[PDB]
Amino acid sequence: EWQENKSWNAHFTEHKSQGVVVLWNENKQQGFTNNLKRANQAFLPASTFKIPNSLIALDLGVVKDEHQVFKWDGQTRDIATWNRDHNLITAMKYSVVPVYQEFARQIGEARMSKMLHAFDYGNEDISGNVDSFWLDGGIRISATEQISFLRKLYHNKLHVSERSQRIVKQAMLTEANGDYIIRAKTGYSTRIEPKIGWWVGWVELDDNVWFFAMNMDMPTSDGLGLRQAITKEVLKQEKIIP
Ligand X SMILES: COC(=O)c1ccccc1-c1cccc(C(=O)O)c1
Catalytic residue positions? 47
181-189 and 173-176 strand pairing:
antiparallel
Q: How far is the CB of 5 from ligand X (least distance, A)?
A: 26
Q: What is the DSSP string of 119-147?
A: TT-TT----S-TTTHHHHSS--EEHHHHH
- Which residue number, 108 or 225, has a Cβ lying nearer to ligand X? 225
Q: Using CA atoms in the order 150, 153, 159, 161, what is the torsion angle rounded to 10 degrees? A: 160
- Which residue number, 47 or 164, has a Cβ lying nearer to ligand X? 47
Q: How far is the CB of 189 from ligand X (least distance, A)?
A: 7
Residues annotated as binding site?
47, 50, 95, 227
CA dist 129 and 6 (Å) reads 39
- Which residue number, 136 or 238, has a Cβ lying nearer to ligand X? 136
Q: How far is the CB of 97 from ligand X (least distance, A)?
A: 7
List the end-to-end C-alpha distance of the chain, in Å, as a whole number. Answer: 26
- Which residue number, 153 or 218, has a Cβ lying nearer to ligand X? 218
Q: Is the dihedral angle over the CA atoms 220, 20, 227, 58 positive or is it negative?
A: negative
* DSSP 3-state of 4: strand
Contact of 118 with 105, CB cutoff 8 Å: no
176: how many CB neighbours lie within 10 A of its CB?
11
Q: Using CA atoms in the order 147, 151, 153, 159, what is the torsion angle rounded to 10 degrees? A: -100
Q: Which residues bind ligand X (CB under 6 A)?
A: 47, 79, 95, 186-188, 190, 221, 224
- Which residue number, 3 or 81, has a Cβ lying nearer to ligand X? 81
CA dist 200 and 144 (Å) reads 10
